[PDB]
Ligand binder design. Structure first.
Ligand SMILES: Nc1ncnc2c1ncn2[C@@H]1O[C@H](COP(=O)(O)OP(=O)(O)OP(=O)(O)O)[C@@H](O)[C@H]1O
Ligand SMILES: [Mg+2]
Ligand SMILES: [Mg+2]
Length: 303
């Protein structure tokens, strides 16, 4: 049969503003900071497909039982694998640094195929109804839409501490692998890539962030929030080989910022969320999202 899960790439959203959109036209979903997954559940047997289009089934054994209540069905799902922090908010860093005791959940937000019917050409409104009929009172988690028009859904989403809202046009088709104007993503917090220039201990109580410039890293502040247990342990192994006596910053750090510090060669790129930039170039109310081993320091610029 000719729907090819093995040829499927996820649909992508366009950065925009949702506050002026109406629920009559747009479905407001919460934005889940996790790992994007396509899921084929063929009468209970689950296969997972990354956005890059590769089998990642073996990387999430906690999801092997995802379809335990769906053994009578053959479905393709779209959703986010999440790991919930102590607030029950999906945490990206707890996902990327997950262990065997780590609870991974799959939160489904689309249905692409159901018992021999491919649904790429079916309107979102109708796919969602089939998704609800499939998952009601099962262990398959389908987060509901946020109530209200756009500004209310966005506010509610902020109240929960979620990442933002994705508005999906109720009449829209599913376009694999395409970034479309029919999905609008709107994030609550700004986000900045940084280069790690040093660390303090309580261990690693915090990191010293910088933006590359002509004379070295321009100090962008200290991040300590959003980091716990498993990740810091890995941070210590990534930092160890980078030990250096020379500071990488373009001005010697103020004494308060340099207290108990070890400098590292400016190699690791991380990502943080922040409210605003101070007039002197520090990140306000920064919090850790995670490390970005795909990026290298020479691409970090003030965004
Ligand atoms: N409810 C949801 N529906 C669809 N996608 C979601 C949802 N929640 C989270 N995501 C995914 O989380 C990410 C949030 O957008 P963000 O701008 O943070 O992503 P990105 O990695 O910067 O860019 P990209 O759009 O290329 O992934 C998007 O990948 C989005 O597809
Ligand atoms: Mg994201
Ligand atoms: Mg992404």
């Amino acid at each position: 049969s000719m729907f090819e899960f093995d040829n499927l790439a996820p649909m992508l959203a366009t950065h925009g503003t949702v506050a002026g959109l109406k629920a009559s036209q747009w479905a407001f979903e919460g934005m889940w900071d996790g790992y994007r997954l396509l899921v084929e559940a063929d009468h209970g047997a689950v296969r997972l497909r990354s956005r890059s289009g590769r089998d990642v089934t073996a990387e999430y054994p906690q999801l092997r039982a995802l379809a335990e209540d769906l053994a009578d069905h053959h479905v393709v799902l779209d959703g986010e694998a999440v790991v919930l922090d102590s607030s029950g908010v999906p945490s990206f860093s707890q996902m990327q640094n997950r262990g065997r005791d780590t609870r991974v959940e799959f939160w489904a937000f689309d249905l692409l195929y159901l018992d021999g019917r491919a649904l790429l050409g079916t309107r979102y409104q109708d796919r969602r109804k089939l998704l609800e009929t499939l998952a009601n009172a099962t262990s398959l988690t389908v987060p509901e839409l946020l109530p209200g028009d756009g500004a209310q859904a966005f506010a509610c989403s902020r109240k929960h501490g979620w990442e933002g809202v994705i508005a999906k046009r109720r009449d829209s088709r599913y376009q694999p692998g395409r970034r479309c104007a029919s999905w609008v993503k709107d994030k609550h917090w700004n986000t900045q890539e940084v280069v790690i220039g040093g660390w303090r201990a309580g261990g690693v109580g915090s990191l010293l962030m910088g933006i590359p410039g002509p004379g070295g890293l321009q100090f962008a502040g200290r991040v300590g929030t959003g980091l716990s247990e498993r990740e810091l342990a890995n941070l210590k192994e990534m930092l160890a080989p980078l030990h250096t006596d020379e500071s990488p910053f373009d001005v010697p750090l103020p004494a308060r910022d340099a207290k108990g510090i070890t400098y590292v060669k400016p190699a690791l790129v991380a990502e943080v969320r922040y409210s605003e930039w101070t007039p002197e170039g520090r990140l306000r109310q920064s919090s850790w999202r995670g490390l970005r081993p795909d990026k290298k320091p020479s691409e970090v610029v003030r965004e």
